[PDB]
Amino acid sequence: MRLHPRTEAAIFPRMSGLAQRLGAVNLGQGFPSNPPPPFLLEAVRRALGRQDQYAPPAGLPALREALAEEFAVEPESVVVTSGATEALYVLLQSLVGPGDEVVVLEPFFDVYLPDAFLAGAKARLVRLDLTPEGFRLDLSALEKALTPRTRALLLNTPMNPTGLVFGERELEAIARLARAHDLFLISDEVYDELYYGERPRRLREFAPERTFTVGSAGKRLEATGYRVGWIVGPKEFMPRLAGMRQWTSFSAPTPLQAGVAEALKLARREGFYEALREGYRRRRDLLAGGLRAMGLRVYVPEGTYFLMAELPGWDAFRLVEEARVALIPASAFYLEDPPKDLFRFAFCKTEEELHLALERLGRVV
Amino acid sequence: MRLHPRTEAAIFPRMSGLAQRLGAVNLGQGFPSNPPPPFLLEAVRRALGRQDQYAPPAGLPALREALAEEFAVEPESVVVTSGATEALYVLLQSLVGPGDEVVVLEPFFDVYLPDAFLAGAKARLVRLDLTPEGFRLDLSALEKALTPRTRALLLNTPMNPTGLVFGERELEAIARLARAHDLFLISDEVYDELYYGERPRRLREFAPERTFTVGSAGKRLEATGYRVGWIVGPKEFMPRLAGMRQWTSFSAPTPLQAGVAEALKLARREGFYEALREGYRRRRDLLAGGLRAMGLRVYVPEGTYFLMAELPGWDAFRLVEEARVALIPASAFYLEDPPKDLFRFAFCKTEEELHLALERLGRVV
Numbered sequence: 001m002r003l004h005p006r007t008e009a010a011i012f013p014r015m016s017g018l019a020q021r022l023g024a025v026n027l028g029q030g031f032p033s034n035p036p037p038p039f040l041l042e043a044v045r046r047a048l049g050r051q052d053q054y055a056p057p058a059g060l061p062a063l064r065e066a067l068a069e070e071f072a073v074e075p076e077s078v079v080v081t082s083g084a085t086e087a088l089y090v091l092l093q094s095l096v097g098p099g100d101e102v103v104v105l106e107p108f109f110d111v112y113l114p115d116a117f118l119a120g121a122k123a124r125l126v127r128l129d130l131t132p133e134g135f136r137l138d139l140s141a142l143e144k145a146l147t148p149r150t151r152a153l154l155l156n157t158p159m160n161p162t163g164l165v166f167g168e169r170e171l172e173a174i175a176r177l178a179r180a181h182d183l184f185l186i187s188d189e190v191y192d193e194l195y196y197g198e199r200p201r202r203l204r205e206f207a208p209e210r211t212f213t214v215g216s217a218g219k220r221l222e223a224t225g226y227r228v229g230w231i232v233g234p235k236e237f238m239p240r241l242a243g244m245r246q247w248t249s250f251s252a253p254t255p256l257q258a259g260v261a262e263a264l265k266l267a268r269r270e271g272f273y274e275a276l277r278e279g280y281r282r283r284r285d286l287l288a289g290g291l292r293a294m295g296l297r298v299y300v301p302e303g304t305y306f307l308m309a310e311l312p313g314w315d316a317f318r319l320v321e322e323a324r325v326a327l328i329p330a331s332a333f334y335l336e337d338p339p340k341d342l343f344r345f346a347f348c349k350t351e352e353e354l355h356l357a358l359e360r361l362g363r364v365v
Numbered sequence: 366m367r368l369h370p371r372t373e374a375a376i377f378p379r380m381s382g383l384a385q386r387l388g389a390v391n392l393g394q395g396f397p398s399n400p401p402p403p404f405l406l407e408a409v410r411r412a413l414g415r416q417d418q419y420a421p422p423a424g425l426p427a428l429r430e431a432l433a434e435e436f437a438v439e440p441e442s443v444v445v446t447s448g449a450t451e452a453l454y455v456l457l458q459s460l461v462g463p464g465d466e467v468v469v470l471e472p473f474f475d476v477y478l479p480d481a482f483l484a485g486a487k488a489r490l491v492r493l494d495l496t497p498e499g500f501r502l503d504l505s506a507l508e509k510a511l512t513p514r515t516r517a518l519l520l521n522t523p524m525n526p527t528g529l530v531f532g533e534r535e536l537e538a539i540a541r542l543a544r545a546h547d548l549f550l551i552s553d554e555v556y557d558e559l560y561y562g563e564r565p566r567r568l569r570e571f572a573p574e575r576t577f578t579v580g581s582a583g584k585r586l587e588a589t590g591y592r593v594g595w596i597v598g599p600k601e602f603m604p605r606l607a608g609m610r611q612w613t614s615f616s617a618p619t620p621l622q623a624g625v626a627e628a629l630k631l632a633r634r635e636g637f638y639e640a641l642r643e644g645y646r647r648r649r650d651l652l653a654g655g656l657r658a659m660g661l662r663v664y665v666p667e668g669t670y671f672l673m674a675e676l677p678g679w680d681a682f683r684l685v686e687e688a689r690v691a692l693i694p695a696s697a698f699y700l701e702d703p704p705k706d707l708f709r710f711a712f713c714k715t716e717e718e719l720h721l722a723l724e725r726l727g728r729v730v
């Protein structure tokens with residue numbers, strides 16, 4: 001007896017385990033070290049005992065409605081998934097298969113390749129250029145990766161781990177290419193409210209007929225363990241997506257969907273997103289400023305709570321052991337030939353924790 | 366542009382919608398019309414604000430530990446999924462694939478065939494015999510369905526929709542067959558605490574080396590929308606299963622896992638399961654007794670909150686329109702040639718709702 005070979009798809013947890021043993025500050029964890037806002041907790045608390053049974057696979061009506069309002073679409077174009085993780089899994093399962101190719105940009109988020117593989121498709125990687133000015137997408141490189149077998153392109157903006165936010169010029173180009181080649185566009189926008197400059201434009205604004213936008217309540221409201229996410233896309237494809245997620249987990253947690261629906265409305269009216277953005281901006285500048293003071297190259301992020309910097313001559317292991325600071329090496333985001341001495345820092349930690357990390361790194365340089 | 370054909374896998378919701386329009390008593394819904402116990406609500410309420418971020422894919426340590434204690438196994442043999450629905454989906458994805466066959470018993474629960482198809486396997490159906498004494502499993506029929514390509518057998522006990530509870534004699538036979546043919550055994554035991562006779566024996570007691578047992582907190586604690594379930598199986602296969610569910614939804618809702626862990630311990634010490642069993646037993650007898658008084662054949666269930674009965678000359682549609690009572694036809698649980706005039710009744714409703722249903726059915730006979 002043996003498991004099917006597709007289970008071959010089954011460093012992040014390992015780095016955290018090593019950090020706990022050595023008592024190192026963990027800047028590798030990709031989630032907040034604080035609780036969610038009080039208005040969310042109260043909304044959930046209020047739903048408990050009133051909405052505890054199965055919600056429709058497509059999602060609680062109140063949540064679909066609340067999301068439709070924000071995206072300026074009809075409720076039927078919204079499907080609630082068990083986290084953006086499920087949204088991405090179901091999207092690949094529904095869009096590609098054996099004989100199909102999907103374009104993924106490198107550095108990538110960890111679920112992209114596994115999801116493509118589990119769907120039976122082939123992932124073609126297009127690497128962003130690391131220029132003196134920072135990360136940049138080369139449109140000619142993207143264009144040359146397209147083949148008659150390509151059916152979809154997966155984009156992540158604001159981007160994890162680079163912190164890159166694609167501008168209107170690049171979004172328009174991607175839209176034209178998708179139209180010319182009749183491709184589906186999957187946009188992982190879980191960090192859509194975490195940006196530091198001008199309000200970014202969305203890919204769906206340029207190619208609404210073929211773009212699926214993914215979001216996460218966990219990444220918007222500092223509640224990653226709630227497992228409530230969504231897909232916003234063309235109405236004609238949504239019923240089938242709802243049908244597919246029905247088999248994977250049936251429906252997202254009902255009381256959590258209920259609380260999130262209410263929290264999304266209040267967050268907007270109470271200016272919670274602006275306060276969140278400023279709180280992270282302060283921490284971004286604290287960390288970036290501290291690293292540059294040490295003479296290190298830091299690629300200041302336009303979004304997300306991640307930042308990448310170069311630490312010449314270091315490897316993640318020696319760092320956590322000597323400096324007592326855990327970081328994630330660039331190798332975790334590249335398939336092969338990762339940039340040298342590049343590391344991802346997560347600044348969704350307390351300022352005290354960040355100051356501690358800088359002091360420790362400073363000692364060992 | 367078009368979705369991949371596997372999306373072809375994407376009457377239950379339709380019957381509920383028809384019932385709402387006509388103001389009919391809905392005995393077709395497979396979930397409680399009441400809230401969960403207070404001790405569960407309080408435990409969740411207590412977890413909110415303390416455990417809101419990502420839990421490990423395998424599950425919160427406290428939940429894995431609480432489950433291991435009940436099943437008399439080590440924590441490593443437990444994996445927490447986002448509902449039993451996800452457990453079943455991931456099990457099929459991990460055990461079978463193209464060129465493999467899975468045996469499923471008919472009448473079946475709705476996710477079995479779709480999960481087998483989405484995994485690329487072929488489902489071979491073995492139909493239970495409907496004898497004068499009720500539903501019965503013919504071992505010779507099961508044995509004749511095995512081929513060299515068979516890799517697993519899917520069992521559901523207590524069984525939805527029949528209410529059948531497999532006895533020791535049948536479990537032992539299945540165990541011998543699984544061993545002789547080196548098959549994996551998947552046992553859907555979400556209703557393991559809802560039985561009306563002697564405490565049933567578990568399949569894993571007879572074939573612990575090749576059996577995966579599935580459970581659901583939602584079906585145990587009257588909280589179906591919480592999406593917390595589990596797989597208990599041989600330690601050597603669990604790491605890979607945890608790896609597979611990581612890609613589908615990452616991890617189950619953290620505060621819900623926390624509350625469930627506590628609730629499972631209290632339920633046992635406070636005799637909640639016995640009280641639950643008696644409460645359902647009263648409703649089972651109320652419904653069964655009322656139907657037999659009308660001269661109808663009722664197959665009294667040994668478990669679950671479902672019961673099947675025969676209503677000669679009726680179809681589900683005419684019933685909901687004339688009697689104003691919604692039921693699910695046997696056709697929803699069979700692939701072809703479903704038994705004539707057989708319907709599934711769900712008695713997880715208030716006694717007042719059940720009395721109303723009986724009065725309405727009585728009028729139209």
Ligand SMILES: *Cc1c(COP(=O)(O)O)cnc(C)c1O
Pocket residue numbers: 082083084085086109156160188190215216217218219224227228229614615
């Ligand atoms: C966190 C994250 C996800 C997953 O979101 P969930 O709602 O927690 O499943 C997907 N994509 C990116 C880029 C993320 O950072």
Ligand SMILES: *Cc1c(COP(=O)(O)O)cnc(C)c1O
Pocket residue numbers: 249250447448449450451474521525553555580581582583584589592593594
């Ligand atoms: C309800 C049910 C399930 C699904 O359980 P969840 O925890 O709600 O996903 C699986 N199998 C059977 C027989 C069920 O009745």
